[PDB]
Amino acid sequence: GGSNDFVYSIWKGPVIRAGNFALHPEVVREEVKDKRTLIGYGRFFISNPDLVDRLEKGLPLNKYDRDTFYQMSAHGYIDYPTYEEALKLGWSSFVKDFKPQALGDTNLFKPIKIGNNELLHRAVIPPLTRMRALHPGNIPNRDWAVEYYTQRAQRPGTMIITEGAFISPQAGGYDNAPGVWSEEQMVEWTKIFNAIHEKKSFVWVQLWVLGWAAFPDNLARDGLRYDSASDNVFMDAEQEAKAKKANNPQHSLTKDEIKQYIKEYVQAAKNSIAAGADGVEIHSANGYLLNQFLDPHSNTRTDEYGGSIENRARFTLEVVDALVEAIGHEKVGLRLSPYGVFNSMSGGAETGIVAQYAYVAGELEKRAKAGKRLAFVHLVEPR
Numbered sequence: 001g002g003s004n005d006f007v008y009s010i011w012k013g014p015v016i017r018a019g020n021f022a023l024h025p026e027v028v029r030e031e032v033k034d035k036r037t038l039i040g041y042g043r044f045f046i047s048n049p050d051l052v053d054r055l056e057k058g059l060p061l062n063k064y065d066r067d068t069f070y071q072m073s074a075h076g077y078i079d080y081p082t083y084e085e086a087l088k089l090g091w092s093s094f095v096k097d098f099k100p101q102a103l104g105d106t107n108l109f110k111p112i113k114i115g116n117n118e119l120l121h122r123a124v125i126p127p128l129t130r131m132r133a134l135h136p137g138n139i140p141n142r143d144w145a146v147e148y149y150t151q152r153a154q155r156p157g158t159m160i161i162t163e164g165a166f167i168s169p170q171a172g173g174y175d176n177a178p179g180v181w182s183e184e185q186m187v188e189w190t191k192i193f194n195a196i197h198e199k200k201s202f203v204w205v206q207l208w209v210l211g212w213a214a215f216p217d218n219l220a221r222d223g224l225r226y227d228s229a230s231d232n233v234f235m236d237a238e239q240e241a242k243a244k245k246a247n248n249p250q251h252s253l254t255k256d257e258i259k260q261y262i263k264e265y266v267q268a269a270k271n272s273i274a275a276g277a278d279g280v281e282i283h284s285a286n287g288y289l290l291n292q293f294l295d296p297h298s299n300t301r302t303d304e305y306g307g308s309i310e311n312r313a314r315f316t317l318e319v320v321d322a323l324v325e326a327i328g329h330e331k332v333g334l335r336l337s338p339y340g341v342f343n344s345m346s347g348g349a350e351t352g353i354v355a356q357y358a359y360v361a362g363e364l365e366k367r368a369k370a371g372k373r374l375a376f377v378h379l380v381e382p383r
């Protein structure tokens with residue numbers, strides 16, 4: 001009882017759908033009929049570095065392991081084999097009861113242009129947190145990350161959206177998540193961007209700000225604030241306990257701090273493109289700071305950044321405008337999850353959510369008509 005099709009009735013640019021598309025090619029085949037729709041594959045791009053070639057010819061794919069997702073290891077990260085490599089290792093099988101289809105005839109493999117990049121296929125690599133960044137310093141993995149991103153840039157002209165990169169330590173909270181603010185991170189990021197560029201593929205950076213999803217103890221350790229939209233609403237009992245235990249209560253953002261966050265967004269974007277990135281994506285989904293401001297359950301502010309649909313979307317659009325005026329509208333994308341209830345979001349329960357995100361896409365399209373259209377709009381499917 002939910003759909004993201006309304007965005008198509010409002011936003012007239014490229015739309016990147018993501019979620020539960022790997023094991024359902026009969027759905028993708030219907031969804032690619034729309035000429036401006038791209039498909040992202042999450043888990044099976046971790047499980048298969050050559051997933052694109054397996055989607056073109058209808059090859060069987062490999063099983064993904066749930067335990068190797070957020071674990072620090074080379075295992076289940078860069079050890080996944082190609083099709084031929086999976087054949088040379090014998091079998092005693094791959095996936096279970098599954099019927100693959102060849103989408104090489106569909107619209108998935110006809111070229112399209114997003115931003116300054118010329119995609120030869122419409123298979124997108126969504127942002128994926130692997131939790132393998134070096135701590136401390138939030139440095140991307142020097143031993144594995146380069147190889148990891150290089151393996152999935154196998155198909156020429158493959159759009160890659162990197163994992164959530166903290167625009168600032170203040171936007172941090174995860175010790176195993178890579179950053180973008182410091183030069184030490186920018187060296188490794190430059191190496192990765194080059195490694196992807198040499199394979200004739202493209203790389204996009206997801207700008208990440210945890211919000212209330214951050215770990216209060218990790219922030220109190222570095223003398224940072226545990227902040228959100230409102231200070232009277234919390235995630236859960238654990239996040240509530242960790243805040244008072246570590247003597248770091250949930251902080252309500254003021255104007256100055258918001259402007260600071262925006263400045264950090266701009267600096268993060270310019271630093272990203274200085275390292276050789278194709279563009280940046282604003283993560284306003286999955287119950288993080290921007291999404292926290294968007295969602296009425298998390299946003300109870302009475303000031304300029306809350307109280308209404310126009311006010312709750314002011315932050316996201318502020319970041320959008322800032323980045324557009326910074327690096328250009330062709331290097332800026334947006335990530336949204338209307339029906340996502342992750343990190344204590346409303347989702348389908350709130351009857352006004354569709355109106356909120358319709359307002360978002362509306363403002364976006366209005367800016368698009370003005371001559372400044374974003375490269376794409378990333379959507380997370382209901383599940």
Ligand SMILES: Cc1cc2nc3c(=O)[nH]c(=O)nc-3n(C[C@H](O)[C@H](O)[C@H](O)COP(=O)(O)O)c2cc1C
Pocket residue numbers: 018019020021022040041042043044069070126127128129130163164206283285286335380
């Ligand atoms: C291990 C893992 C990490 C993820 N990390 C992020 C993330 O950092 N940022 C984001 O926007 N989405 C993230 N996602 C969500 C993906 O963008 C995508 O929606 C998800 O993989 C579901 O796609 P699928 O069911 O087709 O595999 C993550 C998903 C997984 C499984």
